[PDB]
Design a protein around this ligand. Structure first.
Ligand SMILES: Nc1ncnc2c1ncn2[C@@H]1O[C@H](COP(=O)(O)OP(=O)(O)OC[C@H]2OC([n+]3cccc(C(=O)O)c3)[C@H](O)[C@@H]2O)[C@@H](O)[C@H]1O
Ligand SMILES: Nc1ncnc2c1ncn2[C@@H]1O[C@H](COP(=O)(O)OP(=O)(O)OC[C@H]2O[C@@H]([n+]3cccc(C(=O)O)c3)[C@H](O)[C@@H]2O)[C@@H](O)[C@H]1O
Ligand SMILES: Nc1ncnc2c1ncn2[C@@H]1O[C@H](COP(=O)(O)OP(=O)(O)OP(=O)(O)O)[C@@H](O)[C@H]1O
Ligand SMILES: Nc1ncnc2c1ncn2[C@@H]1O[C@H](COP(=O)(O)OP(=O)(O)OP(=O)(O)O)[C@@H](O)[C@H]1O
Ligand SMILES: [Mg+2]
Ligand SMILES: [Mg+2]
Lengths: 255, 262
């Protein structure tokens, strides 16, 4: 129950990493969801007015999410800026009508990466990421999109742990009770895309991280732990298919 | 010859890296410049028609560059597609009229990454990078922009070496002698931005690679070699300031509390 210890640890991390790089200001995307709310509150405790939230709704971003984001900023005195990327996704939709929801969402996530980095350069700030360990392991995120940042304080925290941390940070119940959703298209949700809730995925991901962090996953070993055959096959496939997102691009060694 | 061994080496790298990932098709951005022309020719030899070139001119892109890129595809039978990003940068210019040239250029480089990746997903392909070793060490490129890719065959070749390889690959003279330029704004050139041509930069980078790799750069040692003080200061700064572009993000490790009995 020593989450106060964890909060101090993460705040110290943010302070040290930003300082060692020669910066004193940070920016991050605030979506109205749990993860970015946690990152926003942590940065506010460390940089106060020097931590800035950037809200970037799209043409399909759900309205409620944005208002919840604004309410968070007012509650925690977080300076913010609202910048719509709708004019950009509108062009993409007109040029690629039959584009899959995934392609449309990935473009938006990258547009967000671009404006966060643009904002950072013009204001001399660093971009703080919000991807949690569950998403990172599953590769549930857009490469060079929401996975793009300079520093990420909750990258080794599983989704269930980010939630527990959020409670200690007094994150609004509105955001705490909100089901995870990339919000890249109307009706999207982590549970629907993944097929299982984080209450079922996280326990398995934790054993996989402990047993096979730098070695191949042994589905038979996981089977012995009492995990559903189908569940293991599905989660293992996702992890192995997206392992590349956690690695640097392959560069031919000097001849 | 060693250049032929190099070509075979790079071709094998591309085929093995793409195959081990379960792919058979690749895509890359063709700007009309030397770096992308080199990557395009190499990919054509390995994947033939399965290697696609994506031309993405902006509102400021020089027209001559697109023409040279198109002629390259014709000479080497490279399938291509032209998608202008002008409509997108036009909105950016309208929203941020006073944005710096660097900010505007970074936005375009990132739009190109997004379309290359969009194209790769819809066609079951991998994005091949074109950043050379000089650009990588100097951080002369947009993070998550042109530096973004799955595999990069020329990341360990200095610009000067890329030029020599290009000669053996029979790249059009128009491209070979073309001055390096991000072409993110009218009149841009690597020499004007960096302050020096690669003929002066590369020799210094090669010494830095040989002298410093386990320890930080020592400007006094470089001064003893005979390098000009300004060149050393300029290049050393670019390398140290932009080293972060070649690394993954800093992620906070799991918290391990120091227990009372520890
Ligand atoms: N083996 C390999 N080695 C190196 N590169 C490889 C590769 N295999 C594919 N690639 C490349 O990776 C690309 C596919 O990766 P990527 O573009 O990320 O795309 P993808 O993984 O296909 O889509 C991202 C997914 O996670 C999503 N997401 C996005 C944003 C936020 C959240 C959230 O929960 O907040 C979730 C999204 O909705 C979708 O379900 C390919 O098209 C290809 O260019
Ligand atoms: N220490 C650090 N650790 C982690 N992240 C750090 C950081 N310092 C800055 N950052 C972040 O990195 C950002 C700055 O990097 P970045 O956005 O790339 O921007 P930046 O390096 O400032 O501009 C890109 C540069 O490379 C150029 N370029 C671009 C595109 C193509 C070519 C070409 O030759 O084709 C050359 C360009 O002309 C310019 O000289 C910052 O705003 C910040 O968010
Ligand atoms: N409309 C948006 N405005 C600003 N940032 C956004 C927006 N949509 C996505 N982002 C950014 O991309 C990330 C993707 O959201 P993600 O679903 O992963 O987490 P979240 O919304 O913070 O929390 P949760 O996973 O519970 O929904 C956000 O954390 C945020 O940094
Ligand atoms: N108009 C464009 N169309 C397609 N791709 C582009 C365009 N502009 C830039 N790119 C991509 O981004 C990269 C920019 O890198 P860069 O300008 O340094 O190299 P280059 O133009 O190939 O060669 P050079 O360094 O001599 O200019 C290109 O290699 C290419 O993949
Ligand atoms: Mg969300
Ligand atoms: Mg060029």
């Amino acid at each position: 129950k020593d989450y106060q210890k964890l909060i101090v640890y993460l705040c110290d991390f943010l302070e040290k990493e930003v300082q060692k790089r020669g910066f004193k200001k940070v920016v991050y995307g605030l979506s109205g969801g749990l993860d970015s709310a946690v990152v926003g509150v942590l940065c506010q405790k460390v940089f106060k007015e020097n931590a800035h939230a950037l809200l970037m709704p799209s043409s399909v971003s759900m309205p409620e999410n944005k208002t919840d984001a604004l309410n968070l900023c007012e509650k925690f005195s977080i300076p913010y800026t609202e910048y719509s990327i709708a004019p950009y996704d509108a062009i993409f939709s007109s040029h690629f009508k039959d584009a899959s929801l995934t392609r449309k969402g990935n473009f938006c996530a990258r547009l967000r990466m671009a404006f966060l980095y643009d904002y950072s350069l013009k204001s001399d700030s660093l971009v703080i990421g919000t991807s949690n360990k569950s998403e990172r392991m599953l590769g549930y995120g857009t490469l060079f999109g929401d996975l793009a940042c300079a520093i990420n304080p909750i990258g080794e925290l599983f989704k269930t742990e980010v939630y527990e941390l959020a409670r200690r940070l007094n994150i609004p119940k509105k955001i705490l009770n909100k089901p995870p959703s990339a919000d890249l298209f109307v009706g999207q949700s982590d549970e629907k895309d993944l097929g299982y809730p984080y209450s079922v995925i996280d326990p398995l991901l934790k054993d996989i991280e402990a047993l096979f962090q730098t070695k191949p996953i042994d589905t038979e070993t996981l089977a012995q732990l009492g995990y559903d055959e189908i569940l293991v096959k599905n989660i293992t496939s996702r992890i192995q298919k997206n392992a590349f997102k956690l690695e640097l691009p392959a560069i031919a060694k000097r001849f």
